[PDB]
Design an enzyme around this catalytic site. Structure first.
Site, PDB file in Angstrom:
ATOM      1  N   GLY B  20       0.833  -1.188   0.000  1.00 57.07           N
ATOM      2  CA  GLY B  20       0.000   0.000   0.000  1.00 57.07           C
ATOM      3  C   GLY B  20       0.867   1.237   0.000  1.00 57.07           C
ATOM      4  O   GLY B  20       2.074   1.162  -0.230  1.00 57.07           O
ATOM      5  N   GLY B  21       0.253   2.373   0.243  1.00 55.31           N
ATOM      6  CA  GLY B  21       0.991   3.621   0.266  1.00 55.31           C
ATOM      7  C   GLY B  21       1.035   4.250   1.633  1.00 55.31           C
ATOM      8  O   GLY B  21       0.322   3.830   2.549  1.00 55.31           O
ATOM      9  N   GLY B  22       1.873   5.259   1.762  1.00 56.27           N
ATOM     10  CA  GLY B  22       1.950   6.046   2.984  1.00 56.27           C
ATOM     11  C   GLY B  22       1.186   7.336   2.775  1.00 56.27           C
ATOM     12  O   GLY B  22       0.217   7.371   2.010  1.00 56.27           O
ATOM     13  N   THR B  23       1.651   8.417   3.409  1.00 57.80           N
ATOM     14  CA  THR B  23       1.123   9.767   3.211  1.00 57.80           C
ATOM     15  C   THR B  23       1.436  10.087   1.721  1.00 57.80           C
ATOM     16  O   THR B  23       0.653  10.739   1.048  1.00 57.80           O
ATOM     17  CB  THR B  23       1.841  10.709   4.154  1.00 57.80           C
ATOM     18  OG1 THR B  23       1.490  10.340   5.483  1.00 57.80           O
ATOM     19  CG2 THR B  23       1.477  12.172   3.917  1.00 57.80           C
ATOM     20  N   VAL B  27       4.807   1.531  -0.897  1.00 64.86           N
ATOM     21  CA  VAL B  27       5.683   0.653  -0.122  1.00 64.86           C
ATOM     22  C   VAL B  27       5.627  -0.764  -0.663  1.00 64.86           C
ATOM     23  O   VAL B  27       4.549  -1.247  -0.996  1.00 64.86           O
ATOM     24  CB  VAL B  27       5.397   0.702   1.411  1.00 64.86           C
ATOM     25  CG1 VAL B  27       6.475  -0.029   2.205  1.00 64.86           C
ATOM     26  CG2 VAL B  27       5.254   2.142   1.902  1.00 64.86           C
ATOM     27  N   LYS B  42      10.173   2.034   0.146  1.00 64.79           N
ATOM     28  CA  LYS B  42       9.178   3.057  -0.160  1.00 64.79           C
ATOM     29  C   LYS B  42       9.655   3.840  -1.369  1.00 64.79           C
ATOM     30  O   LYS B  42      10.664   4.530  -1.290  1.00 64.79           O
ATOM     31  CB  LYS B  42       8.992   3.986   1.039  1.00 64.79           C
ATOM     32  CG  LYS B  42       7.899   5.023   0.910  1.00 64.79           C
ATOM     33  CD  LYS B  42       8.018   5.897   2.149  1.00 64.79           C
ATOM     34  CE  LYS B  42       7.016   6.984   2.248  1.00 64.79           C
ATOM     35  NZ  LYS B  42       6.964   7.478   3.647  1.00 64.79           N
ATOM     36  N   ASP B 133       1.385  12.145  13.076  1.00 59.90           N
ATOM     37  CA  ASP B 133       0.452  11.276  12.369  1.00 59.90           C
ATOM     38  C   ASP B 133       0.295   9.921  13.084  1.00 59.90           C
ATOM     39  O   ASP B 133       0.235   8.850  12.462  1.00 59.90           O
ATOM     40  CB  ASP B 133       0.859  11.144  10.891  1.00 59.90           C
ATOM     41  CG  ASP B 133      -0.243  10.597   9.991  1.00 59.90           C
ATOM     42  OD1 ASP B 133      -1.426  10.833  10.297  1.00 59.90           O
ATOM     43  OD2 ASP B 133       0.083   9.974   8.971  1.00 59.90           O
TER      44      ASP B 133
END
Ligand code: A1A1E
Ligand code: A1A1E
Lengths: 289, 288
Positions: B20-23, B27, B42, B133
């Site tokens: 999936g992704g981060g902000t 990744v 990432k 976060d």
């Protein structure tokens, strides 16, 4: 803006002189081709992909102001990637244009200016508007010696920047209320204008604001430090106790204790008689000879 | 970054799956072609005209952390306009990945996660860094039931924006001290992370943060209101007085009154002698 002119403003005006820049754009002296009336035209480069929210906010601020001490708004033109804002022409320029020729203003001259700026600030704050850029360069003087606040560029930019962050903060469910408060309300209020007026009164008296010789980034650090001492007038004997007190109260460190514009208008420095445009007409005569 | 590897990471790593992704970025799970060691990579697109400030800040934050409760950093790669940040792979994924399968965590499991997150926060705050976060999706769990904070994307963006905004703020000689304070400090401090942890503890207990059903714009408006009431656990009897009290103190509305990460580490909930990785290993056994 639905009232915008989709036409070249040079259809209506003859451009006479470059007056300099503001926070953004370039200001011109222009003459109405049919009436001969003078106006100030601020030209801002507006490319097709550019965010127009700052200029939309600046025109909204100006358009909804109807007070003698705030530059009058006449309308705006959009033509060839240029937006032109048409406003009241103030023949003598800024107080900074003036004092760079005349030297320091007298205490009475400063008192009249401070009263007129406070009238404009009281009006603005009564509309939930904040100028955020009060300084000699933004206080204009017309040929009659009357005072007008100008350049809502910083105010519009803050307003657009805060609104852009609002649509991009994402999920707020884990956010602390103080982080959400600063994201929605900026972290300060209209009393920041009262402090700026106090610095401006020093600027008109001394030809520069306090710490002008100190690096700007360093001035920011010094102000954020606990134990920061508000500035004062350099010469003691040259100024009245009322003027020293005006500086003291406008330059109140805590914004919770800083007096409002309306409260400041009852200060003896600005409520004294003999405060009228004739004092600035004397300053304009000093500029000429 | 001065330590950047100017080569493609795919020469040293086999990409196994998308995580999936981060902000920002995407990744991937990757395996060291020679040692067989697993890592997380990432990937962020890097154009020549693009500002490096945010990624520079993210790498600096990661590289300068040396703490068991912060995702380990292995290095960064730059090749053909792609930046690859190499980090510690955490086999069980995020706490959100876990609770979506297992359901609500028990009080002891939440107490353990809270202690470990507070340890990473105490470390971050001692270095003058702020996460900003903290949530279940950003608390990772390795195969040993150990806890790691991840995704400094928001932290890096705020830091870069704060620095970028300064130049466009103009001259400061006429600026009031409070305007100068919000320009340099942002208008809040590291205690924002304590609140976020309090919300995370509710999220782990209830599978959603408070006001999950309310539109995001309305939530921000509700929070800004002078009379905003800090949220609480929904069920009362399911949880001990210690956990209710931990929620109460971490969600102190006033930042001047909110306890620091170090102070919170002495709280009865997270200073219990029975807190250990075995509690999460029990949670992880439920998955397989
Ligand atoms: C403060 C100014 C830069 N500005 C930024 N946004 N709107 C304005 C604005 C708005 C209305 C009028 C005017 N000016 C400026 C000026 C000068 C300046 N040396 C010199 C002589 C006359 C004038 C005059 O009428 N300016
Ligand atoms: C928090 C994450 C989005 N991230 C943003 N910036 N760095 C990271 C980061 C850094 C190191 C590791 C990892 N992950 C993610 C993950 C998932 C996610 N479903 C699922 C399974 C394993 C993992 C794992 O090892 N992620």
């Amino acid at each position: 803006d639905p009232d915008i002119f989709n036409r070249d403003p040079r259809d209506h005006y003859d451009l006479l002189q470059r007056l300099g820049g503001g926070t953004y754009g370039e200001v011109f002296k222009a003459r109405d081709k049919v009436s001969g009336d003078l106006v100030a035209l601020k030209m801002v480069k507006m490319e097709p992909d550019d965010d127009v929210s700052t200029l939309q906010k600046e025109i909204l601020i100006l358009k909804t102001c109807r007070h003698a001490n705030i530059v009058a708004y006449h309308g705006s033109y959009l033509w060839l990637q240029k937006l032109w804002i048409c406003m009241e022409f103030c023949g003598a320029g800024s107080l900074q244009d003036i004092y760079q020729v005349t030297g320091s203003l007298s205490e009475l001259q400063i008192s009249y200016v401070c009263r007129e700026v406070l009238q404009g600030l009281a009006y603005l704050h009564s509309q939930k508007k904040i100028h955020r850029d009060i300084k000699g360069a933004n206080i204009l003087i017309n040929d009659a010696g009357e005072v007008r606040l100008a350049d809502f560029g910083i105010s519009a930019q803050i307003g657009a920047e805060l609104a852009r962050r609002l649509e991009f903060i994402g999920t707020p469910y884990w956010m602390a209320p103080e982080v959400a408060a600063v994201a929605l309300k900026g972290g300060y209020n209209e009393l920041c204008d009262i402090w700026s007026l106090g610095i401006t009164a020093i600027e008109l008296a001394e030809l520069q604001p306090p710490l002008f010789d100190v690096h700007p980034l360093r001035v920011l650090f010094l102000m954020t430090k606990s134990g920061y001492q508000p500035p004062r007038l350099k010469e003691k004997g040259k100024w009245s106790a009322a003027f020293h007190n005006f500086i003291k109260v406008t330059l109140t460190k805590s914004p919770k204790k800083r007096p409002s514009a309306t409260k400041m208008l009852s200060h003896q420095l600005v409520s004294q008689p003999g405060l009228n445009r004739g004092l600035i007409l004397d300053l304009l005569d000093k500029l000429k000879n």
